[PDB]
Amino acid sequence: LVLNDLLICCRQLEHDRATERKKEVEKFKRLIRDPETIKHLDRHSDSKQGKYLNWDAVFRFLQKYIQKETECLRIASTQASRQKKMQEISSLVKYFIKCANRRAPRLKCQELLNYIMDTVKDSSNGAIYGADCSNILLKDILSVRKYWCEISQQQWLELFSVYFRLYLKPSQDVHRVLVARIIHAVTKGCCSQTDGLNSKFLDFFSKAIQCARQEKSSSGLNHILAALTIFLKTLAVNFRIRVCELGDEILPTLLYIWTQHRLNDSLKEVIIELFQLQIYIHHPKGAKTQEKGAYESTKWRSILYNLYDLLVNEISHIGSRGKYSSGFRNIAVKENLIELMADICHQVFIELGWEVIKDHLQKSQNDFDLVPWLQIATQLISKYPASLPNCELSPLLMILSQLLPQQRHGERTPYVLRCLTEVALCQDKRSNLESSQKSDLLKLWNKIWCITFRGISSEQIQAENFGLLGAIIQGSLVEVDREFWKLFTGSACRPSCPAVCCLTLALTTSIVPGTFSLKESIMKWLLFYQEVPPILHSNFPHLVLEKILVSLTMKNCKAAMNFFQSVPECEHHQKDKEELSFSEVEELFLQTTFDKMDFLTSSIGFSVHQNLKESLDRCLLGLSEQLLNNYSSEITNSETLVRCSRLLVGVLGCYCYMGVIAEEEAYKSELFQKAKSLMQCAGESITLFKNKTNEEFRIGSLRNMMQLCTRCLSNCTKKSPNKIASGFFLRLLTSKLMNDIADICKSLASFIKKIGAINPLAEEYLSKQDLLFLDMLKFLCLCVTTAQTNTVSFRAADIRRKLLMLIDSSTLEPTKSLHLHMYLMLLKELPGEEYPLPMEDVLELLKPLSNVCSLYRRDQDVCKTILNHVLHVVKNLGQSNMDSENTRDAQGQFLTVIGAFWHLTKERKYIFSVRMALVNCLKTLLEADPYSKWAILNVMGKDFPVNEVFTQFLADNHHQVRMLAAESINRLFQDTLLKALPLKLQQTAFENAYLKAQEGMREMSHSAENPETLDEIYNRKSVLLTLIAVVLSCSPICEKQALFALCK
Ligand SMILES: [Zn+2]
To answer: I want to staple 414 with a disulfide (CB 3.0 to 4.6 A). Which of 45, 174, 464, 901 is the partner?
Structure first.
């Protein structure tokens, strides 16, 4: 009904009658605002049934209208009227697209992109109209994630070309900076969602930089250089020599624009980022010669020297310092400048050695001229220990010594202390000094210790001088004295993390002397029974105070502390750091030049002084009662109670680890009872929040508690005291608290509330409730995983069922960011190999995987994260086929998903990051079963074993995927005690891999712009050689075969 009215109104809009045109525009806008027409149009457009009346059809009619007025009016005041009418047309277009995109994207991106390109390309029709269309493109197309992901690579390239060509043509400043922003967004989109730009586009950037030299102003240079950094980061992986050449031919211009012209802070930061990127590319991980993996040229050396001079001059200035937050005379230089300066100093160090640094340290009058050189020396010594010569060790300290005393703490004191710490660590690392040098260093270090010991009670440089004392003790550069222990005893200084670290180092190195009394004096200083103890105020490192307390109450503290320190680490756990950086690309650069070959490479008799043990127990109790009696529902922080329970549990765990007391005895001890009472008094807060959850002030405390509890537990399988403490703490919990946590998780899960495009998993869409729910879910997953090896009060099966009830087809909404986050966390954490889940739970976990893969298709980042989080289920699958039907069903589901991804990667559908995530998933599948008994991908009715599929990636276009497949080709020659696969399989796999590498080389080799594919030749040869080396090193069957292949 209404659609007929809209059609009539638009057909009348097509007519060339001005008064009527205006009346029909008013009627059309009113009908746009009509909810009935809105719902009819959106339903018919989502139907895609060709009803001739959708948002696209009315958009086409509006375009015809606009073309009608443009053609009619093509034939001062007239210009003003024209620009005003164009502004009105732009406003109408913005209003139309706003209404058509109010709820969901109902406008196809191709039509809008073509309209924008058509308007922008023509230099006529006023620059204001083009600026408005650029604004609508930047704020209504690139901002929508669906439009961000569904734009084809050809459209990306066309947008980049058109807008960069417009940028090169001179225009106004505001339009120029808008075009620069659009160019930056387009470069980010093209480099993140599709294949990267062609290297020839690099020419464009160079031209812009040249203009920067000619015209004094810098209009949008920051955005252009940010786009250049993105382009170089995505292009240097497999175009290293080309990037080196372009850096060589653009960097002098950047140095000139830095020096001759005075610029802003943002441009300085982006230029420093470019310089650091070029340093990383030329000298990956500080390689200072060609034989050790560096690309070197005379021009690059001259650039290095000139840029060192420029950085020295910049350091000499005043604006290159920290922000004057409420004044305070911020004296330190920014971290990026110091890091760049240290890297260049490492790459440069005939008269420009350490003598320059020593002279600057000696002849600097004010602290303003002294602190930057202390920072430079500190960074250079810390990052590159070999930089400082042994013969220069003795002199430098002398200068540093004269920089230490001022009769009071000064502005340069923390920096002098840090430099002394770094020098001490380097000297401990050296271990090749001469006797005279050792004696002179011993005398200097004794003098430095004497100077530093005075003023230890400053309380403003506590961390720095405690670190210095700890480093000196660790290096054994001086023997400790009675006053050093008196520093800990007598409550002279408040306990803190640096203090306990120094105490740990002292206990490890030296033996505690008498004056028994000293030991329990230290213990009472720690516990400090007194309005809260200092330990409970701050989060100490896990199992440090407990280790010190246990080691103190032993026959020999040194041996006990050494036993605690000498504990093996967990190989598959380690720690999480540097999630994203360029360092993996530097690793790749070292790998290609074959300068980093990674694929080839309990005690008894402990006894306890009893009286010390009851003293420790009575102190721990006294603190426990002190917290328990002086406890209220709001007066005391509950994380304090959790910390006290963790301390008691850790003390018990260390005691059990050394075997002085039995594990059964620990449960019967009153320490466990007090820990249980403290945990219950902490859990009443969770219960109270479960009662009412609309508050927000409790969320921070609850999040702190959940993070602390998560840190308390562990999933490790070694014999460390970590395991014993985690088991004790997990037995400490009760069923009521677990049920309340699960109920809160369920309540928060079903909660409703209401540079171009941000990721769905950006941690910005998440609210405080979402973060609390994520922390609680992580804690619950750790509990249910670890409880499988303990007899615990709460039932792990019920909690696991409650967790799996969250991912249900009747409730799960994969569109919402919180639901995707929780499903990814469930995939990441729930499956286990030590105690596998029953296959029914695996089926329940894998049921919604296909749906979330389908909804988030065409999104590269989400697919990459999904693969990364689903590769953890393979270790659970294929485990003895306990339930046959369920096992085959789960394997079929997982293999269908993996086959869908592989089939899509056969086409030009997924970018290199998704492909290498898939390569990692295939590696996990190969490790699950070396024999393709069940891991077979079914595509288009044809079956492919994963063995033959894995070698297909050795001929991939992107170098990262090729090297990832090559360095892990040993999974086809080993069981992974590593058992060797049968001879036939090994020979067939080696032959297939060799043929794949040779086929890639031959396909690349034939002509195809060899100045640009010199890098391709180098990369393919490196891939082949790495494959041969890995095969030769791993499999002993094919040593002769690999050697003859190498000779051939
Ligand atoms: Zn472990």
So the answer is: 464
